[PDB]
Design a protein around this nucleic acid. Structure first.
Lengths: 418, 399
DNA sequence: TTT
C-alpha cells in the first residue's frame, strides 16, 4: 500500500517544514541553515522538548532547551548559544505537523542521531565492561538509541546491542535479589521478556531462536544466561541476524527539499530505495572542518551515517558510492559535533560530498549452532541500479577491489562513545 | 646536540631497516604496524648477529598477514647473511651494534613487564620480594655497557650467586675478572659507602662461597630500602621508528633522546596494532606495551598513573598474557586492536650494622605542549592504591 | 539533549 509512501512522505515533509520555521525563528540565513551542526542543534532541541522525563527538581531550568548555533559574522564562523522554552519548540513542531502527534518524525531524527553515532564512535570499552568480545563491534547497530525509541528503534538494534542490554539487566539481577521481586520486579520481568522476543525476532535459525526461548524462561537469570547470550552473539558473526536498516537524513536536507517546493506527501517517500539517494544527489550540506581534518573524510562519515552503512562491506559501499569508502581508523576526521571548549573561529566549512554513482535496495542447540557455523561459506552488491533507473530493471554487476578490507572497524582508533 | 645526533642516527637506522624488511616481506602498511610483526623482524636481526650472547645459517619465525578478513600465520625463513646485509645497508655500511642492543633492551623491558621471575629467585636462594630489583634479568649474557647499566641490583646478585655456586671452576683467571667486573658493576649501582665497601669485600675473597652469597642476599635486601641507581631506557618497537621514518621524520637532523619528551612524542602519534587472544582485554594489553615502552615495570604505579592519566594497575589484575603468540595458538580466531600508547604528561659486619642503622632511619612532569620543560606540574597521587606492579602477581614464569 |  502506496499509503506507506504517503505516510513517510508526510513525516519528512513535516520535518522539513519544522526546520524551515526554526531557521526563520532563529534568523538563520539560508547558508547557516545548510550547516549540519545547526541541523543537529535544532534536532537535539525538538527531541529534548518532547522528552517527558523532566525531573522538575543543579542550576539548569528544566523548562528550557537550546545549544550552539553557528553564524557568519565578519567572514568567520562564530558560536552563539541559544535558550528556548521547550513549550514553544513543541508548539513549532505541532504547528509544522498540522497538530498531529508526529512522534514518527521525532523517532526519525533519533535514528539519524543513532546512525551518525554508529559511524563516528567506538563501543569496544562498553563491550569489554559487559564481558563481550571487541569483534562484536560489527553487531552494535543502534547501541546509542534511547529506551523511548519504540518499534523503529528496536527494529534497527543489532544482535550485540540487544545482548549488551540483556547482559546489563542480568548483572543488576545478580547484584540485587530484590531486582526481580514484587510489583516493580513484575515490571522489569516483562521488559526482560520483550527484549528476549525482539532479539529472538532477529535470529534467522530455529536453533538460535530456541536458545532465546530458553534464555527468556529462566526464573533466576544469571551467568548461565549471560554465557548463552555471549554464545549467541558469537554465532551472529557467521549466522547473521535480520536487522532493519533505515537511511534517515538530517532535518536540513528535508528543509532544503521542502523550501524548493518538493511535495513529499504527493510524491511519497521511502527510507529503502532510490528516495534518499535522489535527495542526497541534489543536497547542499556544509560542515565545520577542524584544522588538519580532511573534508573528504568528514563527507565519508556523513554519507555513511545518512545511508546507515557503518556495518556494510566497504567494497560494496565503495561500488555504490563510486569513490573508495575506507576504514574509520584511516579517516582524518573526528565527529560532526563541535565540543564547547573548541575554537570555531579557526574553522572553515566545506560542502559535504554526499552524492553516489549508484543507488541500492542449551547443549543440543549449541551443538547444532556450531555445526551450522562450521558448514557456513566464508556478491552482497546485488540490487545496485543507475540513478536514471527509477524502476529497478537493470541490476549493475559489482566491481570491487577484493583485496581491500571489508569491515569499517578494521584498525579502528575512533573515540569511545561518552 | 651530538649525543642527540648519534641516538637520532641509531633510531633512524632501525626505522630504515624495518621499512626495508616490510618491502622485502611484501608486508602492507597495516601488517607492518602489527607489533607481533615488529617482534619477529627484531628477533630475526638479533639472531642473524648471533644469539645476542635446525639449520644454524637460517633465521625466521611467524609473520601475520591479512587474508580474506582474518589474520593468518605464515612461517618465514631467511639466511642470516642476507638479514645482516639488509641491516648494514640500512645503517649505511656501519655495523650499528648500538641499534641491535636498543632492540634487545626493548625485548628485555617487555619481558620485565610480562613475566614473573620469583621461581628463578627461589632457585638461587633469594626472596620473592626481590622481584622489584630484577630489571634486565632476561638480558642475554654480556649485552655490553647499555645492558649492564639497566640491570637491577637483584639481577646482578642473581648472576653473582649463580657464579659462586658453580665455583662451589676457578680459564680460571678468565672467570675471576668476569666475577670482579660483575662486582664493580653492582658496586657502581649502590649509592652508600657502606654498601659499596661490602661489595669491595665480596670482590676480594680468594675462595668465593656461602659467606659471599649471604653478603649478596643481605645487600639485595638493603637495596629494598637503600635503593640503587639504575639506568632506565625507553626503547620502542622497530615498527614505531619505521612509521616515524616513512612520514619523512629525520631523526639525524632533529636528534633523538631516550630520556625526555622524544619517546612520548613518538608514542602520542603512533599507530600500533596487537593480536588480542579471546577473553583478553585490549586496554590491559595496551598497559603492558605502554609500560614496556617507558621501562616502567619497576616504577611506583601512582607515579605511572599520574603521567599516563589513566590508572596503571598491578600485573595480577591484568586480563592479558604477553604480546608474543606461541606456535600452537590459533591466530585465525584472533582480532587485532590499536594499542592505546598515549600519555597525559611526559616526565624526565661493621658495614652490615651501619647498613641496618640506615635502613631503620629511612622514613619533572610536564604537558606534551610544554616542549621546553618550563612549567613543572605538581603531582597528585591516589596514595590508597598499591605502588608495586608485583603486588598480587600471577604472571607466567619466564622460560 | 541550554555553555
Amino acid at each position: 500500500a502506496t499509503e506507506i509512501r504517503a505516510s513517510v512522505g508526510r513525516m519528512v515533509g513535516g520535518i522539513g517544514r519544522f526546520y524551515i520555521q526554526m531557521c526563520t525563528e532563529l534568523k538563520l540565513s539560508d547558508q547557516e541553515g545548510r550547516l549540519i551542526q545547526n541541523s543537529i542543534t535544532i534536532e537535539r532541541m525538538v527531541l529534548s522538548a518532547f522528552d517527558e522525563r523532566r525531573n522538575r527538581y543543579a542550576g539548569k531550568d528544566p523548562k528550557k532547551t537550546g545549544g550552539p548555533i553557528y553564524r557568519r559574522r565578519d567572514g568567520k564562523w562564530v558560536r552563539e548559544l541559544i535558550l528556548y522554552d521547550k513549550e514553544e519548540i513543541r508548539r513549532i513542531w505541532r504547528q509544522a505537523n498540522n497538530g498531529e502527534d508526529a512522534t514518527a518524525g521525532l523517532t526519525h531524527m533519533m535514528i539519524w542521531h543513532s546512525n551518525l553515532n554508529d559511524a563516528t564512535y567506538q563501543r569496544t570499552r562498553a563491550l569489554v565492561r559487559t564481558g563481550m568480545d571487541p569483534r562484536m563491534c560489527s553487531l552494535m547497530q543502534g547501541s546509542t538509541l534511547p529506551r523511548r525509541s519504540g518499534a523503529a528503534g528496536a527494529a534497527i538494534k543489532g544482535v550485540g546491542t540487544m545482548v549488551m542490554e540483556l547482559i546489563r539487566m542480568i548483572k543488576r539481577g545478580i547484584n540485587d535479589r530484590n531486582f526481580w521481586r514484587g510489583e516493580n520486579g513484575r515490571r522489569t520481568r516483562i521488559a526482560y521478556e520483550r527484549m528476549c522476543n525482539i532479539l529472538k525476532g532477529k535470529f534467522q535459525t530455529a536453533a538460535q531462536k530456541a536458545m532465546m526461548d530458553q534464555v527468556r524462561e529462566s526464573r533466576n537469570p544469571g551467568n548461565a544466561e549471560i554465557e548463552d547470550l555471549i554464545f549467541l552473539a558469537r554465532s551472529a558473526l557467521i549466522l547473521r541476524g535480520s536487522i532493519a536498516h533505515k537511511s534517515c537524513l538530517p532535518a536540513c536536507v528535508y528543509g532544503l527539499a521542502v523550501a524548493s517546493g518538493y511535495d513529499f506527501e504527493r510524491e511519497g517517500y521511502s527510507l529503502v530505495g532510490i528516495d534518499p539517494f535522489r535527495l542526497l544527489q541534489n543536497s547542499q550540506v556544509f560542515s565545520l572542518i577542524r584544522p588538519n581534518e580532511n573534508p573528504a573524510h568528514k563527507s565519508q562519515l556523513v554519507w555513511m551515517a545518512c545511508h546507515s552503512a557503518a556495518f556494510e562491506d566497504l567494497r560494496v559501499s565503495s561500488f555504490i558510492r563510486g569513490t573508495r569508502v575506507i576504514p574509520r581508523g584511516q579517516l582524518s576526521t573526528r565527529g560532526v559535533q563541535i565540543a564547547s571548549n573548541e575554537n570555531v573561529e579557526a574553522m572553515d566549512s566545506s560542502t559535504l560530498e554526499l552524492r553516489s554513482r549508484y543507488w541500492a535496495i542449551t547443549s543440543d542447540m549449541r551443538t547444532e549452532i556450531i555445526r551450522m557455523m562450521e558448514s557456513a561459506r566464508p556478491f552482497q552488491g546485488r540490487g545496485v541500479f543507475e540513478l536514471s533507473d527509477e524502476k529497478a530493471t537493470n541490476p549493475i554487476v559489482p566491481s570491487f577491489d577484493m583485496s581491500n578490507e571489508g569491515s569499517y572497524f578494521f584498525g579502528d582508533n575512533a573515540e569511545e562513545y561518552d
